[PDB]
Amino acid sequence: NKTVVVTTILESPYVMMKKNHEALEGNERYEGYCVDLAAEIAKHCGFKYKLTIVGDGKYGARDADTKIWNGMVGELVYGKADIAIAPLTITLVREEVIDFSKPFMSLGISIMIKKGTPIESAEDLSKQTEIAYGTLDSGSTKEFFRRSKIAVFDKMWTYMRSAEPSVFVRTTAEGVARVRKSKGKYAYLLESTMNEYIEQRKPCDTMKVGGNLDSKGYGIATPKGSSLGNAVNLAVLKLNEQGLLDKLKNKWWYDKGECG
Amino acid sequence: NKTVVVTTILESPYVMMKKNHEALEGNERYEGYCVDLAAEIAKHCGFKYKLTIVGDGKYGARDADTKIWNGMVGELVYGKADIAIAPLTITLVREEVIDFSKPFMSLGISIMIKKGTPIESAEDLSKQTEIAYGTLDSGSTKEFFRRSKIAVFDKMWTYMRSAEPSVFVRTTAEGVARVRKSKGKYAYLLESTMNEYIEQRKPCDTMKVGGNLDSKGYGIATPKGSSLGNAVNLAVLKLNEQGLLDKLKNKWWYDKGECG
Ligand SMILES: N[C@@H](Cn1cc(Br)c(=O)[nH]c1=O)C(=O)O
Ligand SMILES: N[C@@H](Cn1cc(Br)c(=O)[nH]c1=O)C(=O)O
Q: What is known of its domains (chains A, B)?
């Protein structure tokens, strides 16, 4: 009937501007895991779509005062977009206002260190102060620590929320740059699949250490009651069962890995 | 309003008969990961329930001729039970007839060998014939191979469906017993979390080898349109975010591990 508005976010390798995007237009301007996923979802659900980058560049959180939802979640809640296809974490608070398909990717919070840093776990981080550590300034990773009642994670949150200077960063790129330029005095807490991706990128000076702190997944989101919800959910299950999601990860993570 | 009928299956350590069940009655007769999960789900959703073991002892498949659904899926489809709480895999074909909550456990098909067996991957298995291998005779693991278009898995299915004697087993216990009693001439393909569980059970003679063949999850199921669906889904997300699901796995898998 009508072209579906897809909201997504510039997060490598999910969505990236093609080198020669200027010579291109529309959906052809972008490339990445979620760009490929969107094409597959649309084909299996039978709809035409337009890729758009979330206006405020955020994932989705609710302001405690205004009660307004920002980010991709907000665009769905307010009808500015019809579906969100990005590394958007399935969480309780979001599930209450929008619908999520079954997960297309499984992950967990993990630790990124510059090679050589004497840290092997969250426990290690929480028991020392020489090495600073933080998370993305907004998102499920930060919220995980803020709301955690688990001893170690609660101790980590207490340190992070009051640390000076700030240990929180605006983007993944900033967190990675901080790890790489801090001579081992900064460790970054981020979602495991991103940690895995960066570990295979030059200058190959970072690595994931320890096990994941939690377990969760990314899901495709639609406004509550959307007529696209059901088909999208089944499409995700079909793509996973056919092994296409596994193929996409290899395509964007390892096939072109730069660290051997 | 009315007591919720919960259908589940006798699969250790999800649901097991307590040693002194005779002296007990009702829900108290059972113990296990899913027994604990059911209590948590009911508490968070505010309902009273009765645990029942699926009549035909199956998970859920559709007969191609009669079109009738068997197992736990069947009990939901036909209204014999109101909710299924067990290690039930979220699959496309099932999602089409019943509703699934977001996953409460992530897993994948894996290889179980008796210690010392010269096999490290699915590739290894597919390229030889001395060592037989099979799966549970019904369920998502068998279906995975039957429907797989991936070269290695397709080759494995071709061998398994025609192997003599049969390499398929009726229950997990039978598969494990066959691995343990075949002197390394039988390898068992099963869901990873079960493989992990058995590896920590006496006589400690089995082990998981290689990476998982796929990625998926178990979900709580309800009849399509059930008024319990929404609350149950949010309950699962809440329990995971609070770290309770992680605690339950440790309780039933490692806290009482028998292999050191
Ligand atoms: N997926 C998160 C966003 N997000 C992303 C990355 Br990458 C990370 O390391 N941490 C996060 O919270 C959300 O949905 O808020
Ligand atoms: N979870 C499956 C059943 N199931 C269980 C175990 Br344990 C296994 O090794 N393989 C399966 O197919 C389903 O839902 O069919």
A: The M4 transmembrane segment mediates tetramerization and is required for cell surface expression.
H or E element in which residue A156 lies:
helix A151-162
Dihedral (C-alpha) B216, B218, B220, B222: value to the nearest 10 degrees?
60
Structure tokens at A138: 């907004």
Range 61-100 of B in CB contact (< 8 A) with A: 90-92, 95-96, 100
CA-angle at B216, arms to A32 and B58, nearest 5°: 155
Cβ of A241 within 8 Å of Cβ of B149? The answer is no
Q: Check the CA dihedral B30-B6-B108-A107 and report its sign.
A: negative
CA distance A102 to B90: 9
Q: Which of A91, A150, A233 sits opposite B95 (nearest CB)?
A: A233
Instruction: For residue B7, say whether it is annotated as part of any ligand binding site.
Output: no
From A95, A149, A238, residue closest to B237, measured CB to CB: A95
**What residues have CB less than 8 Å from B209, skipping those under 6 apart?**
B111, B112, B113, B119, B120, B121
What's the residue count for chain A? Answer: 260
In order of their start, the domains of chain A are: 2-107+217-256 (3.40.190.10), 108-216 (3.40.190.10)
- Cβ–Cβ under 8 Å, residues A71 and A151: no
Q: Which ligand is nearest to the CA of B93?
A: 2
Q: DSSP string covering B174-185, please?
A: HHHHHHHHTTTS
How far apart are alpha carbons A144 and A201 in whole angstroms? 27
CA distance A116 to A125: 14
Choose among B63, B68, B89: nearest CA to B11: B89
Sheet strands (E) in B9-150: 16-17, 30-31, 49-53, 83-84, 98-100, 105-107, 109-114, 132-134
Q: What share of chain A is helix, strand, coil (3-state, %, to 5)?
A: 35, 20, 45
- Nearby residues of A98 by Cβ (< 8 Å), 6 or more positions away: A73, A76, A77, A84, A221, A222, A223, A224
- Give the method used: X-ray
Ligand 2, atom 4, residue with closest C-alpha: B139
B89 Cα–ligand 2 center, Å? 7
User: What does this entry list as its resolution, in Å?
Assistant: 1.8
Nearest CA to ligand 1 atom 9: A190
Residue whose C-alpha is closest to residue A74's, from A96, A95, A97: A97
